[PDB]
Design an enzyme around this catalytic site. Structure first.
Site, PDB file in Angstrom:
ATOM      1  N   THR C   1     -17.715  47.977  19.421  1.00  0.00           N
ATOM      2  CA  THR C   1     -16.560  48.041  20.420  1.00  0.00           C
ATOM      3  C   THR C   1     -16.285  49.209  21.115  1.00  0.00           C
ATOM      4  O   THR C   1     -16.684  50.371  20.501  1.00  0.00           O
ATOM      5  CB  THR C   1     -15.113  47.592  19.537  1.00  0.00           C
ATOM      6  OG1 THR C   1     -15.271  46.162  19.068  1.00  0.00           O
ATOM      7  CG2 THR C   1     -14.008  47.587  20.397  1.00  0.00           C
ATOM      8  N   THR C   2     -15.772  49.205  22.449  1.00  0.00           N
ATOM      9  CA  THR C   2     -15.059  50.175  22.888  1.00  0.00           C
ATOM     10  C   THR C   2     -13.975  49.568  23.676  1.00  0.00           C
ATOM     11  O   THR C   2     -14.047  48.418  24.135  1.00  0.00           O
ATOM     12  CB  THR C   2     -15.810  51.164  23.910  1.00  0.00           C
ATOM     13  OG1 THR C   2     -16.988  51.602  23.297  1.00  0.00           O
ATOM     14  CG2 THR C   2     -15.311  52.369  24.723  1.00  0.00           C
TER      15      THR C   2
END
Lengths: 214, 238, 202, 206, 229, 204, 228, 239, 218
Positions: C1-2
């Site tokens: 994730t970001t």
């Protein structure tokens, strides 16, 4: 003694514009042997239009299957006869997987069926209860073998060639037969038969299809 | 009367007056009629008949599981409590035994659930009488429940207001019900229910519900387009 | 994730990637990571997708119930605080959810990072997920408070993109939202490989 | 341990100082998080733990003290009181299912005469509190990595009688010692002093 | 008295405390609903005790969800407790099944609270008139104290509820416009309520079949209904 | 160790119609020192003084309890609690938490105001009373103090003699303990009068 | 007037009125008759059918409790079933815990203490029915009657209900040392036919059940050929 | 616990035990609220200046939270339970949501609690009508009345307690929408003087403005009472 | 005290189940005279590999629940499919308390022609099939049983299905440690289940490669 026992197998779903094809293999494998070659428990009907494919532990798939039926069967009574949509059951599955997150069902589900328009739709879960709507998907042993193949032949992402017209009910089935045949040959824990369920407006039409015996 | 105020009080003549009074709640509820033939059960329920162009749906018949359902009479609140109970229990059962609850065993679960209420101080009897109707291995069963906890396995019956007319009809014809076909049963079930109607009004889709269960037929409720098959092609002649 | 959000004059950007990877193999390349709760509240999911999708949906029930009872929309302060008190009661039940509740209410735009351990922080700028460290890199370069909505989305989209370019667990589709006095609007939904051929044309 | 709180008590004020550093693992989010909450007009608490237990404990106190001021018709409870209430709450917590509030407080206030009849401590009160509930009245205390640098630097310089002005000079040296000597970048410090007049936010020192 | 218990039948089969709680509704404010195919209407006399009362406070009508309104009659206190339950249930349904609750199901969930008296001392002294829009279209239901949830095409509960059912049998036809239903709803309230009708003296609120949304009518908009009459 | 965390030592000592109870002044966390003005003695009534040693949290918690219980005694019973009772009350309170204990070792001095007989009790953390004629100790310097007290202490000593050996004991032990010292507060109880002394020792 | 409203209350004469009252509910109910032989034990009961349309085996007054023991209720049927539901719970606790068929002597006393517990407390009312427990466990063939008070008593022959008086005269004419379980069915069923009012209760049948060396000491409804 | 049913319906549909709690209000001490443009005024009557009652000031208008004050009428004992239940609720709220709770919220809580008592087995109803004033965070002033039934309404001005109807029937004649801090106080006392003893020592009152609560001193007050009791000699001369 | 290994195989109009008459407390063969195959009501048999203790409790609780439901209410006895559904949930419920029925049951039964054969695991894993085994049977016998069902695809005769058990039992005896050469065979047919008197099987040990001189290390 472990209360969890991965009973293996692979489920796939592909959603066209009218239909959903839903496949789940019939190999129920225990600890180093196999118990059955004709286990139909993988896929389960909740309503005419909505099915729930389920991988991992059988015993939990079977508990969940009932638990889900008896919240669908309750919905039927409280909302005067009316059956729940796919989209309703989909959020119900997510809600019911989570209420048990402190002793999870070890079961990687896919609620699959038709939305109100008639457009086919499939949702996937993890043990805890994480809904993600997808268009083509595959959980289990042959996740890694099938899901790249589908990714190439549907999305055509890395191809200069013009995207193919649409993809009919019979082509999408023929694609999945081809995929599973190439997963039985190359994964050990996939094989025997695959039960396909072709959900359309007209009603479900299941046709079991033979793989490599080993 | 000083003995009629509480459930727990026996009269000196040995009558539990509060139950006789819950039994009046059934006789003041709208008429329903059950009949069973060799394979099929039929519940015909008189709904409330529209006042001019003004409608009023009230859930009088309930499905309970594939193979069972309920007509009720009297306090609809209490009927909805029993519907909930029986449903929970038929699921509980089907969960365990991958098969519908036998009807004899269901007859006894409502007999017991009634009685629990008619002995404790805090509790009151159920104002409702049921017509359980269902099909299992042992053929079709029609059951009339009553507030007292008594459960009667009937060949046919009615239950509600002017129901003494309906039972007077059914008494002439109930013997021929084993012979009769599904359509002849429904006629007999309606002809009876019709004997119960007030003065000049008729049966018709908007003022009557039919429901059926039997061999290979899951318990189905017929309202409007479904029921017309039986109800458009019907009249009451002496 | 970001996953990154930040506050500027114009309001609040929320940018995310669109990949949910189990370490090595990539389950899905289309995870909608900006949860849309109310029409003035954006939760962002990072960490245990299950826990966020559930709790940020509960938060949504409690926010709507408040709208019915109190005849007026909840604050973002209170919205974040509801989530903060659920994650606090469950801190030693092994939850995992680095969330950001962004929104616009009576008291201007407000962004709140809300941890698994009941943490609740008013941020002007923030990034969560494996590729945060990469986003913050780009993002602390171009970020002022006086950006135009154009330049803010440009900045966020780059920041997510440069996380997707480096982090293996971050990837897929770089979705951006804006939160304004009129609610929230989904700005863009750009694939991160098309983005490379925009930002580096050679 | 990351985030250093300092406090010291003189003739007619307590001075309190708390790291601005808001950290997610090894990432500075900001250097502008006020950790010194104000429980009263004349009472504040430099709490330094993880944000969750820090807030949920300084809120629980701040509410249950406001709730007492309601039920006690505007009566401002002594410092000894809230300090012993805080510690009784921290102690109760290490023998519950929840576990310890993992927060190291430097509770500081200034008891003023609350009416004509008050005979109790007039003047400033500083208390050091562990997460366990180790309450202790002190002239100067600290929590966090920097603590032991400041605690020794105060042993050296701190006298009980220095001005409001010599307290700014001293609190600067205490803050500057945590800047020089701790790797963890406690690079901005919120300094609040308690006097007879109330809480004032010292902006001069950081 | 306390001679008869709470859970006690009369010699003619009605529970007393219910039969009585029903006579507590015939004192309360008159409130009514009109199920037209274009959408459903709810209107209620506020019966404000004085001029001074901020009329917007003592709301006879209540948002239960986007797509469902309730109007109450009898003990307003008790109605808050029903509607508060109905809200929580409406949202539990949205939470669980990602969809609007039915109106039928929201009315069932409001008679799941109205049965359990023996946990609570007495029934609620309130009749709700729940109206909304779902897949069935626009529906109007009535709860009693009994627990007997009854779908109606048009019903009035309260003071002149029996005088308003006289008018409905004359004027109501299934194929009404939303505009005709509002006009009827306010025509009845004028004839029935004790005070002279004003824009502030009643509240009207409709759920339209098209958008499936609740609009509470402001006094400006209620004056627009009194205009065309 | 959880007992050795907050540090401290306490020692009581019986003479003729007097006892001297004497704490250290240190409060620590492990090796790092917080305060050097933390005496561990509390005074229940005229005729009872008890030191608490161990985890300071519980010293302070279990103290507030003993204070709540010996005040509720003083109201209900309408009289000052006697050593015997107070020490046995403390064992009951400690043993109430056999499983999940208070990390405290109460040393109790006491003296019957009529008779003039001294009573000492050194309860372990789960209320195991040890009630010797002579002296008792607890806390981090406990090994070292038994060594001191055993040599120095004779039976029928007078308040002044006793104090000087109780003080020399507590000091000459806290020299050899990391987690005790910064002087000591003794407290010399007699039927007659209660003499509280602050003793100068090392700064270590 | 207050001396009879609850079972928690002795009158001045020293009798619980609410229990005597429940006892009146037994003596206005359908007549039951039973006979203990050497072979086993027989229970007959007249069921007075209200409607002509009832099935055969509707309002079954006789219930198997265990393999060897069945109750025959006489009185308020629904109440009686709560007794049976209990008697069962006790009879199966005997098999589960103590690994044995419940003795008839115990099962009766277990049912008495149940029917009694409802004659003590104000909250409960006494049971409207007598139970006729008929067991054949290791204590031989046993017949027992638990009445509303909780008063167990063992019988050779017993009659309950509105004909109790005349039906007891006809049970005295039998010799209980001699008769078999096959004679008894005919004589008890013959009795219930003779005493039953023909003008009051037109619609009725005579449900009979036994347990004997014939039926494998298993408690069952006798076939419909033996009944007349 | 004893959960016998106390609050039950009678033949005519009345909850007798609530009708009787409202009778305990009617006998209680009168209290009055007045909303203005910028200011709320809650003004109560005291039992009257006995030489014994402590010269140290006891306030009959209870603070619930910084923003929110309430006067009651009925059973002192019960009211002091509502107030300590509200006081608790306002701080239970501040913990769950960073917001200070608004008046219209707390009223609906206290109302909800007064209702629970009319429907709980074991409890009688609270014999307490409650005039809650206060300001939301936003700036808006609010006045509310909770009667023992549980039913809450918001007013522009209101009375509870003895001759509550006589005051409200007097108020709604003379009230004006936009009122200043001084006109409000003047009006609040004017309205209270309709029912209360001619004296100025019984009336205590509180003036809420945004972030600013102040009780009137008996010096500030007796200016407004002489100013008003001369205006009730002008309205006695006309009739 | 543990049970050995159960095998069962459907034939035309019935099921055979077969099981060593041996409980084994660890390595030790404690009791060679235990009847491991139990009858559940009038239609069905059951048998369990694993903790004879946890099987003795589950087979008791089920055989109660059948002969109750039948004796109490005037119903038809439960069908094998139902009995087995009840056994399956009873076992799943016990793994969901972390108090498991730590035993693989096989379950056979025949109502009419309706012929039912199923296994269940400790954890609730349930499976119908035309041949089941538990314990070593699964690794050893099942391969042979499945081969005898592939070869006679119309269905086995009772003589063929007995010879193929006897073959597997012989091989279980040779190769499973905790077994003995004394088996019972349940036979579900239309009339109901019959458990055979214990029988041994003929065993061949006189191969010329099993002689002393060949197998000698030196």
């Amino acid at each position: 003694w472990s209360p969890y026992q991965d009973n293996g197998g692979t489920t796939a779903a592909i959603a066209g514009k009218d239909f959903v094809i839903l496949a789940g293999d019939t190999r129920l494998n225990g600890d180093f042997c196999l118990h059955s070659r004709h286990d139909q428990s993988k896929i389960f009907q909740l309503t005419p239009y909505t099915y729930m494919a389920s991988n991992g532990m059988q015993a939990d798939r079977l508990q969940l299957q009932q638990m889900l039926k008896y919240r669908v069967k309750w919905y039927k009574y409280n909302n005067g006869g009316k059956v729940p949509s796919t989209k309703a059951i989909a959020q119900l599955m997510s809600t019911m997987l989570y209420h048990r997150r402190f002793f999870p069902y070890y079961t990687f589900n896919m609620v699959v069926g038709l939305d109100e328009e008639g457009h086919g739709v499939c949702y996937s879960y993890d043990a805890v209860g994480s809904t993600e709507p997808f268009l083509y998907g595959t959980r289990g042993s042959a996740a890694s073998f099938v899901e790249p193949l589908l990714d190439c032949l549907i999305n055509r992402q890395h191809m200069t060639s013009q995207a193919p017209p649409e993809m009919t009910k019979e082509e999408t089935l023929a694609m999945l037969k081809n995929a599973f045949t190439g997963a039985a040959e190359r994964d050990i824990y996939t094989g025997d038969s695959v039960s396909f369920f072709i959900i359309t407006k007209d009603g479900v039409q299941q046709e079991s299809f033979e793989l490599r015996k080993d | 009367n000083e003995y009629d105020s509480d459930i727990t009080t026996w009269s000196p003549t040995g009558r539990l007056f509060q139950i006789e009074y819950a039994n009046e709640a059934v006789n003041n509820g709208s008429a329903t009629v059950g009949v069973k033939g060799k394979n099929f059960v039929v519940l015909a329920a008189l709904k409330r008949s529209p006042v001019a162009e003004l409608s009023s749906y009230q859930e009088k018949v309930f499905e309970i599981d594939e193979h069972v359902g309920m007509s009720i009479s009297g306090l609809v609140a209490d009927g909805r409590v029993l519907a909930r109970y029986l449903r929970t229990e038929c699921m509980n059962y089907r969960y365990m035994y991958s098969n519908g609850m036998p009807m004899n065993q269901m007859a006894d679960m409502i007999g017991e659930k009634h009685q629990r209420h008619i002995q404790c101080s805090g509790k009151r009897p159920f104002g409702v009488g049921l017509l359980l109707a269902g099909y299992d291995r042992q053929g079709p069963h029609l059951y009339q429940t009553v507030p007292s906890g008594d459960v009667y396995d009937y060949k046919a019956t009615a239950m509600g207001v002017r129901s003494q007319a309906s039972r007077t009809y059914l008494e002439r014809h109930f013997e021929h019900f084993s012979d009769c076909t599904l359509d002849e049963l429904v006629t007999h079930a309606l002809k009876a229910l019709a004997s119960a109607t007030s003065e000049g009004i008729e049966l018709n889709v908007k003022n009557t519900t039919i429901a059926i269960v039997g061999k290979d037929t899951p318990f189905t409720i017929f309202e409007e387009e479904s029921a017309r098959k039986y109800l458009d092609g019907f009249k009451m002649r002496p | 994730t970001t996953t990154l959000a930040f506050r500027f004059n114009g309001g609040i950007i929320v940018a995310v990637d669109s990949r949910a990877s189990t370490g090595q193999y990539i389950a899905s390349q289309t995870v909608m990571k900006v949860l849309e709760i109310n029409d003035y509240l954006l939760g962002t999911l990072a960490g245990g997708a299950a826990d966020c999708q559930y709790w940020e949906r509960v938060l949504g029930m409690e926010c709507r119930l408040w709208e019915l009872r109190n005849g007026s929309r909840i604050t973002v302060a209170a919205a974040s605080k509801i989530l903060a008190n659920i994650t606090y009661a469950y801190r030693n039940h092994g939850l995992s959810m680095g969330t950001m509740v962004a929104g616009w209410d009576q008291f201007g735009p407000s962004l709140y990072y809300v941890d698994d351990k009941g943490s609740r922080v008013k941020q002007d700028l923030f990034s969560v997920g494996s590729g945060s460290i990469y986003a913050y890199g780009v993002l602390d370069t171009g970020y002022r408070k006086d950006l135009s909505v154009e330049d803010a989305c440009d900045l966020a989209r780059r920041s997510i993109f440069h996380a997707t370019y480096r982090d293996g667990a971050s990837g897929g589709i770089v979705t951006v939202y804006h939160v304004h006095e009129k609610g929230w609007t989904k700005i863009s939904r750009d694939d991160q490989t098309k983005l490379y051929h925009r930002y580096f044309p050679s | 341990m990351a985030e250093t709180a300092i406090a010291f008590r003189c003739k007619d004020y307590v001075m309190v100082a708390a790291a601005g550093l808001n950290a997610f693992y090894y990432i500075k989010i900001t250097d502008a998080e006020d950790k010194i909450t104000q429980l009263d007009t004349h009472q504040l608490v430099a709490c330094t733990g993880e944000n969750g237990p820090r807030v949920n404990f300084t809120e629980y106190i701040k509410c249950n003290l406001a709730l007492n001021r309601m039920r006690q018709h505007g009566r401002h409870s002594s410092c000894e009181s809230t300090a012993n209430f805080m510690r009784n709450c921290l102690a109760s917590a290490i023998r519950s299912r929840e576990g310890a509030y993992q927060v190291n407080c430097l509770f500081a206030g200034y008891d003023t005469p609350v009416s004509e009849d008050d005979d109790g401590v007039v003047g400033p009160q500083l208390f050091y509190m562990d997460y366990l509930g180790t309450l202790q009245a002190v002239p100067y205390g600290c929590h966090g990595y920097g603590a032991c640098f400041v605690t020794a630097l105060l042993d050296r310089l701190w006298r009980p009688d220095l001005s409001q002005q010599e307290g700014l000079e001293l609190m600067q040296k205490c803050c500057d010692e945590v800047k020089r000597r701790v790797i963890i970048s406690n690079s901005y410090f919120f300094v609040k002093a308690v006097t007879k007049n109330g809480v004032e936010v010292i902006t001069a020192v950081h | 008295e306390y001679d008869r218990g709470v859970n006690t039948f009369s010699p003619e089969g009605r529970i007393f405390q219910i039969e009585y709680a029903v006579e507590a509704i015939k004192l309360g404010s008159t409130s009514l609903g009109i199920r037209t195919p274009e959408g459903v209407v709810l209107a209620a006399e506020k019966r404000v005790p004085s001029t001074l009362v901020v009329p917007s406070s003592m709301s006879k009508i209540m948002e239960v969800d986007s797509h469902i309104a309730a109007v109450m009659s009898g003990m307003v206190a008790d109605a808050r407790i029903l509607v508060e339950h109905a809200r929580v249930e409406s949202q539990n349904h949205r939470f669980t099944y990602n969809e609007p609750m039915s109106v039928e199901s929201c009315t069932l969930a409001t008679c799941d609270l109205s049965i359990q008296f023996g946990l609570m001392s007495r029934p609620f002294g309130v009749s709700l008139l729940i109206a909304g829009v779902d897949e069935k279209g626009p529906q109007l239901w009535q709860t009693d104290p009994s627990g007997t949830h009854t779908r109606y095409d048009a019903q009035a509960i309260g003071g002149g509820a029996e005088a308003a059912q006289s008018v409905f049998t004359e004027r109501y036809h299934r194929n009404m416009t939303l505009e005709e239903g509002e006009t009827l709803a306010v025509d009845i309230l004028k004839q029935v309520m004790e005070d002279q009708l004003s824009p502030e003296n009643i509240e009207v609120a409709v759920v339209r079949a098209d958008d499936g949304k609740l609009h509470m009518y402001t006094p400006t908009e209620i004056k627009a209904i009194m205009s065309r009459m | 160790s959880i007992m050795a965390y907050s540090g401290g030592s306490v020692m009581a000592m019986a003479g003729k119609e007097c006892f001297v109870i004497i704490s250290d002044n240190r409060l620590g966390e492990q090796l790092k020192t917080i305060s050097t003005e933390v005496p561990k003695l509390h005074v229940v009534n005229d005729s009872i003084v008890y030191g608490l040693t161990g985890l300071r949290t519980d010293q302070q918690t279990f103290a507030n309890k003993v204070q709540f219980r010996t005040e509720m005694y003083k109201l209900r019973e309408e009289r000052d609690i006697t050593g015997k009772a107070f020490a046995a009350m403390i064992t009951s309170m400690l043993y109430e938490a056999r499983f999940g204990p208070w990390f405290v070792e109460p040393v109790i001095g006491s003296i019957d105001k009529s008779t003039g007989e001294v009573y000492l009790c050194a309860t372990d953390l789960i209320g195991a009373p040890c009630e010797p004629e002579d002296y008792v100790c607890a806390g981090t310097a406990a090994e070292s103090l038994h060594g001191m007290c055993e040599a120095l202490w004779r039976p029928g000593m007078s308040p002044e003699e006793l104090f000087e050996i109780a003080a020399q004991a507590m000091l000459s032990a806290c020299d050899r303990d990391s987690l005790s010292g910064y002087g000591a507060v003794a407290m010399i109880v007699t039927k007659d009068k209660v003499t509280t002394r602050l003793i100068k020792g090392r700064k270590d | 007037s207050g001396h009879d409203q609850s079972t928690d209350v002795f009158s001045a004469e020293g009798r619980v009125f609410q229990v005597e009252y429940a006892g009146k509910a037994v003596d206005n109910s359908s007549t039951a008759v039973a006979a203990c032989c050497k072979d086993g034990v027989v229970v007959a009961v007249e069921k007075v059918h209200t409607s002509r349309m009832l099935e055969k085996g509707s309002n079954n007054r006789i219930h198997a409790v265990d393999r060897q023991a069945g109750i025959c209720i006489c009185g308020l049927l629904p109440d009686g079933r709560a007794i049976v539901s209990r008697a069962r719970q006790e009879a199966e606790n005997s098999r589960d815990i103590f690994a044995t068929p419940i003795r008839g002597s115990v099962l009766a006393n277990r049912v008495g203490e149940f029917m009694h517990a409802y004659t003590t407390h104000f909250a409960y009312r006494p049971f409207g029915c007598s139970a006729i427990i008929a067991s054949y466990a290791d204590d031989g063939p046993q017949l027992f009657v638990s009445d509303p008070s909780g008063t167990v008593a063992g019988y050779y022959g017993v009659a309950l209900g509105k004909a109790k008086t005349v039906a007891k005269s006809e049970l005295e004419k039998l010799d209980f040392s001699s008769l078999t379980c096959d004679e008894a069915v005919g004589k008890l069923a013959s009795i219930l036919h003779e005493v039953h009012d023909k003008q009051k209760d037109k619609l009725y049948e005579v449900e009979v059940a036994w347990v004997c060396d014939k039926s494998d000491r298993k408690f069952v409804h006798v076939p419909a050929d033996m009944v007349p | 616990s004893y959960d016998r049913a106390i609050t039950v319906f009678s033949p005519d549909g009345h909850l007798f035990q609530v009708e009787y709690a409202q009778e305990a209000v009617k006998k209680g001490l009168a209290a009055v609220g007045v909303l203005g443009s910028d200011s709320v005024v809650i003004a109560v009557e005291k039992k009257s200046a006995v030489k014994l009652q402590d010269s140290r000031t006891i306030r009959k208008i209870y603070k619930v939270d910084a923003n929110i004050y309430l006067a009651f009428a009925g059973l002192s004992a019960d009211a002091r339970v509502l107030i300590n239940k509200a006081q608790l609720e306002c701080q239970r709220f501040s913990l769950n949501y960073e917001d200070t709770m608004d008046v219209d919220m707390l009223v609906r809580y206290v109302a909800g609690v007064q209702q629970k008592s009319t429907q709980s087995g074991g409890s009688r109803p609270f014999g307490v009508a409650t005039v809650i004033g206060g300001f939301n965070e936003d700036g808006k002033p609010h006045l509310w009345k909770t009667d023992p039934s549980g039913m809450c309404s918001a007013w522009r001005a209101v009375a509870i307690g003895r001759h509550d109807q006589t005051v409200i029937e007097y108020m709604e004649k003379s009230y004006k929408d936009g009122m200043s801090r001084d006109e409000c106080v003047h009006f609040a006392i004017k309205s209270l003087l309709e029912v209360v003893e001619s004296g100025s020592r019984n009336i205590e009152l509180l003036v809420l403005q945004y972030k600013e609560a102040r009780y009137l001193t008996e010096e500030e007050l007796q200016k407004f009472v002489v100013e008003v009791e001369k205006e009730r000699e002008e309205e006695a001369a006309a009739k | 005290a543990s049970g050995g290994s159960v095998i069962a195989i459907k034939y035309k109009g019935g099921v055979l189940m077969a099981a060593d008459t041996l409980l084994s407390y660890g390595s030790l063969a404690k009791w060679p005279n235990i009847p491991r195959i139990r009858l559940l009501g009038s239609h069905s048999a059951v048998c369990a590999t694993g903790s004879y203790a946890d099987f003795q409790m589950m087979a008791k609780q089920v055989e109660d629940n059948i002969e109750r439901q039948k004796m109490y209410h005037n119903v038809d006895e439960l069908s094998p499919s139902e009995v087995f559904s009840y056994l399956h949930r009873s076992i799943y419920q016990k793994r969901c308390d972390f108090d498991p029925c730590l035993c693989q049951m096989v379950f056979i039964g025949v109502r009419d022609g309706e012929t039912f054969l199923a296994g269940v695991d400790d954890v609730g894993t349930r499976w119908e099939d035309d041949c089941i085994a538990t314990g070593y049977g699964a690794y050893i016998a099942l391969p042979l049983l499945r081969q005898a069902l592939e070869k006679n695809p119309d269905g086995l005769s009772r003589g063929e299905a007995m010879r193929i058990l006897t073959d597997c039992l012989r091989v279980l005896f040779y190769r499973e440690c905790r077994a003995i050469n004394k088996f019972q065979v349940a036979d579900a047919a239309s009339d109901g289940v019959r458990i055979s008197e214990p029988f041994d099987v003929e065993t061949h040990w006189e191969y010329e490669g099993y002689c002393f001189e060949k197998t000698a290390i030196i």
